[PDB]
Amino acid sequence: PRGSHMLDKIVIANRGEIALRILRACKRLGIKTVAVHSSADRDLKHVLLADETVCIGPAPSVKSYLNIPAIISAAEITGAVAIHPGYGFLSENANFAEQVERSGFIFIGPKAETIRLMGDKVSAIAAMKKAGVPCVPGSDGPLGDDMDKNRAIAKRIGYPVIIKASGGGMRVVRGDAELAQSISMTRAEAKAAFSNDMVYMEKYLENPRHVEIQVLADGQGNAIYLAERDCSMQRRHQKVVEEAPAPGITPELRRYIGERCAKACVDIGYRGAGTFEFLFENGEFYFIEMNTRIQVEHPVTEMITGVDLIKEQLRIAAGQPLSIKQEEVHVRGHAVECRINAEDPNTFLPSPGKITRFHAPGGFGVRWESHIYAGYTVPPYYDSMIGKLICYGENRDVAIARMKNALQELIIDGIKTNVDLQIRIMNDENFQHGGTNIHYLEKKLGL
């Protein structure tokens, strides 16, 4: 008897900690699960737990996890009625979403168009300006040689400003007195750089913070924002720590930025979960991008607000308008997340191999999200992330206090881990204070 709850069976088109995370949501709602794997992830936790499994190609992701037709066929042969992309991989690949629906399957996620829309870095900027989402003030197109208006623009943006090459990989100006020469000095550097003279300008965010807002939208006119997170602790581009709610955000400001994202979702016709990423400097938000999918650090939200986001995606993809409304969403306590990498906390590059001994942390407020275990062999291919350690507190202090101690309990031998590092971040006098910038980590370390 098919559908004693619509989406009977689901392909989890992903791997690692997210796959397992999703599986756990399905199993607990009585959805049969169908895990798609490769022969590197033959012995993954989520795979050993699934109701069915299917091998879809060799180790490399391009041949396995990026294999659109290999996934759809798996859906096809198991009587699956829906596919969960997770994050990264095809989650924001519009072509993939299309072929799944085209192939008669529900894609737990947004429409193929909205993925393109928010994937085109200009389309998204456009659509956000219209929706009224605050963005980086800019010249809105290249700079003339009319030094009257290049001054007119800078003044309208508020110094400092940054001159930027269009085919480049850039100069800060702290006032009128140095604008003409600088525009010029940037031209020179650009002329040589990629053969292009052309440059533009936009406001300079000197010490900004990465703040991001999690939304849900049913496609049917309803969208709620679920607080926000602070993700400023970053190594190269990689997010290292993620707290929520973001310290020193007055509810007046939270309510402000959230409501805007909500509207934007409605205006853009959003469907599913997704994240709005901003810079935040001097009490102002500047939109960087929206990740069209579920977010990695989604759990910190979970902890504070209660709500099951994975559980809520399923509910929308079934075609039900959001069970929740903002007036019900509530921030309670604090939550901090530390990413765990099969890495070396010095020469920062993956450290695959067998985990000879593993012990996970426990107790009140500690949550561990991981597909690893004693005996597990982290492969060389896929991403370096092996777990997420999320600690919950009644406040930021008690949370930070828990994590510091969860991290010691944690045991992973046989590979190097970023734990020694996570311990010295949680043990940072300033991180304790709160409010540190998107540069603070690289300054504490090398780079």
Instruction: Cite the annotated binding site for biotin by residue number.
Output: 339
E strands, 122-222, are: 161-165, 171-173, 199-203, 209-218
Give binding residues for Mn(2+) as ranges: 277, 289, 291
Extract the annotated binding site: 121, 164, 202-205, 210, 237, 239, 277, 289, 291, 293, 296, 339
Residue pair 392/365 in contact (Cβ under 8 Å)? The answer is yes
Q: How many helices (H) and strands (E) does the chain have?
A: 15, 21
Peptide bond into 352 cis (omega under 30): no
Rounded Cα distance, 245 and 222, in Å? 23
The 8-class DSSP code of residue 414 comes to S
Tell the residue number behind the tokens 């050993």, with chain if given: 48
By the 8 A CB rule, do 64 and 47 touch? no
Give the CA dihedral 47, 50, 56, 62, nearest 10 degrees.
-50
Q: Is 291 helix (H, G, I), strand (E, B) or coil?
A: strand
Distance of alpha carbon 82 from alpha carbon 239, whole angstroms: 30
For every residue of 242-262, DSSP letters joined together read EEESPTT--HHHHHHHHHHHH
Q: List the one residue out of 361, 388, 393, 134 whose CA is nearest residue 245.
A: 393
Question: Which two tokens mark 55?
Answer: 């091998």
The annotated binding site for hydrogencarbonate is made up of 239, 293, 296, 339
Indicate the helix (H) or strand (E) that contains 126.
Answer: helix 121-131
Is 229 marked active-site? Answer: no
- Of 21, 293, 367, 402, which one is the catalytic site residue? 293
Alpha helices in 326-444 (DSSP H): 396-409, 419-426, 429-433, 440-444
Residues annotated as part of the active site: 293
